[PDB]
Design a protein around this ligand. Structure first.
Ligand SMILES: *[C@@H]1O[C@H](CO[C@@H]2O[C@@H](C)[C@@H](O)[C@@H](O)[C@@H]2O)[C@@H](O[C@@H]2O[C@H](CO)[C@@H](O[C@@H]3O[C@H](CO[C@H]4O[C@H](CO)[C@@H](O)[C@H](O)[C@@H]4O[C@@H]4O[C@H](CO)[C@@H](O)[C@H](O)[C@H]4NC(C)=O)[C@@H](O)[C@H](O[C@H]4O[C@H](CO)[C@@H](O)[C@H](O)[C@@H]4O[C@@H]4O[C@H](CO)[C@@H](O)[C@H](O)[C@H]4NC(C)=O)[C@@H]3O)[C@H](O)[C@H]2NC(C)=O)[C@H](O)[C@H]1NC(C)=O
Ligand SMILES: *[C@@H]1O[C@H](CO[C@@H]2O[C@@H](C)[C@@H](O)[C@@H](O)[C@@H]2O)[C@@H](O[C@@H]2O[C@H](CO)[C@@H](O[C@@H]3O[C@H](CO[C@H]4O[C@H](CO)[C@@H](O)[C@H](O)[C@@H]4O[C@@H]4O[C@H](CO)[C@@H](O)[C@H](O)[C@H]4NC(C)=O)[C@@H](O)[C@H](O[C@H]4O[C@H](CO)[C@@H](O)[C@H](O)[C@@H]4O[C@@H]4O[C@H](CO)[C@@H](O)[C@H](O)[C@H]4NC(C)=O)[C@@H]3O)[C@H](O)[C@H]2NC(C)=O)[C@H](O)[C@H]1NC(C)=O
Lengths: 208, 208
């Protein structure tokens, strides 16, 4: 038979009121031979009726991928409500439920430190600007870079890693032309997380 | 029916001559109704017969688990040989095959850069010492920290992360008591990877 995977909203979406946070139910391996899929959604137990049940894509294995989507209240998600996605594709002897909720526990504020390039990287053409983000809980977080209020794109951020004290840390690495590190521009790492004031903080970095 | 899982050697094992690298072929969900399992092992598609196959073990869920281990030559792994585990069992229409090899791609030398604490971190109980390792390929790598010849302990290393040029990077974080960094003390981040001479480098860090 077909299987089911349930997904949390993107971290940035729950933290900024402008954005629309969603839980996503993904039904995989649904066959032509019995292709109709049903969904039912529950918050904290109660059936609600906000979900859209968007259709419906091909595949290599010629099986299907049926995806349903539910919008969620920012504060609900952050207060720990659990979301139940229920899938009925008879071909299923009984319908599948899956449940998801935010990680439990006292949210902890990230500490953010920008670290300049090593001396030895300076004999290169591009240099690495590093943002260390640590001491945060839960692991939901977003990190971005900018300069002169314009986004930097050439950066990569590690996944959150569980640290020895049970909090998380990560690093983000921005690569810039050494031209710019010397020509003196200011660069900033922005962090969004629920335990920050206004869910956001920014730390700057430039040549001292 | 039965599932097969094929595990690569540990990065350290293929990189150090003193160690012994093994590929491990594990079969789970073997039934009582058909408990016989047969392994065949192939290196670049040539059958080999020096694997060591352990007597099957009944699990608590009343299925058997059976393991076969093939010692591989360091040079063969690093030269990219493909290792095929073939598993036969009278409950399959046809044998299951898994193959594993080192990541294909030109290997690339890691660059190692040490980064001292952000000054903002001084007002802390403890402090973070950063080791950036970038530009390496394949992603198989090992990282450790020591000082005065003896291993630290209190460190965590991110998974390798795909960078925008197709090499990998990671960071490893070592936390030490603020006094020690202030005591003039000297730490070393050491890295092992196939594109290093003697498969090893180490870079030091101390309060300047
Ligand atoms: C036929 O085709 C379909 C099409 O899929 C693929 O399409 C092509 C192009 C190739 O990529 C092929 O791989 C494949 O053919 C196949 O569909 C696949 O079905 C498999 C199952 O076999 C699914 O695997 C699961 O993946 C989820 C997470 O997947 C996310 O990320 C994927 C990339 O990594 C991405 O492909 C997915 O789209 C999905 O992406 C997320 O999607 C949402 C909404 O779109 C989005 O909001 C996210 O931002 C996005 N994230 C991205 C893009 O990165 C994974 O969670 C599953 O792992 C759990 O379950 C496994 C058991 O199956 C288990 O082994 C794991 O350990 C894990 O188990 C969980 O573990 C935690 C603890 O860690 C525990 O708490 C949980 O209880 C536990 N759950 C358990 C036990 O189940 C799983 O690996 C693929 O997603 C899916 N691919 C697609 C595109 O949908 C299908 O298999 C084919 N059929 C065949 C070959 O017969
Ligand atoms: C009956 O019981 C057995 C045995 O379980 C034991 O007994 C029972 C009664 C209970 O008490 C259990 O608690 C107890 O553990 C069950 O057997 C299990 O079967 C599951 C599958 O259902 C297997 O899952 C796979 O696990 C591997 C990783 O497994 C390693 O790590 C485990 C700890 O996390 C560890 O328990 C295992 O022993 C194993 O350990 C490694 O072993 C090697 C070899 O000795 C060793 O060198 C390593 O050092 C060691 N590692 C460590 C840290 O210990 C996982 O990788 C598998 O994931 C792949 O497949 C999934 C689909 O099944 C897929 O969703 C995943 O994404 C992934 O797919 C892969 O994706 C990645 C890319 O991200 C890539 O690697 C691959 O290319 C890709 N492959 C595929 C398929 O596309 C998978 O989760 C358990 O290992 C296994 N337990 C044991 C001990 O063997 C059994 O399920 C029970 N049966 C029933 C019906 O209940």
């Amino acid at each position: 038979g077909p299987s089911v995977f349930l997904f949390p909203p993107k971290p940035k979406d729950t933290l900024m009121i402008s954005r629309t946070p969603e839980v996503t139910c993904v039904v995989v391996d649904v066959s032509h031979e019995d292709p109709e899929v049903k969904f039912n959604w529950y918050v904290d137990g109660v059936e609600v009726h906000n979900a859209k049940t968007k259709p419906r894509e091909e595949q290599y294995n010629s099986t299907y991928r049926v995806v349903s989507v539910l919008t969620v209240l920012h504060q609900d998600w952050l207060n720990g409500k659990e979301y139940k996605c229920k899938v009925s594709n008879k071909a299923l002897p009984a319908p599948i439920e899956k449940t998801i909720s935010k990680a439990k526990g006292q949210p902890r504020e990230p500490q953010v430190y920008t670290l300049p390039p090593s001396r030895d990287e300076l004999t290169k053409n591009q240099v690495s600007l590093t943002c260390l983000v640590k001491g945060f809980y839960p692991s939901d977080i977003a990190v971005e870079w900018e300069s002169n209020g314009q986004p930097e794109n050439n950066y990569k951020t590690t996944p959150p890693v569980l640290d020895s004290d049970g909090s998380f840390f990560l690093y983000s690495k921005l690569t810039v032309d050494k031209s710019r590190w010397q020509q003196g521009n200011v660069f900033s790492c922005s962090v969004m997380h629920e335990a920050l004031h206004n869910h956001y903080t920014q730390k700057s970095l430039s040549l001292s």
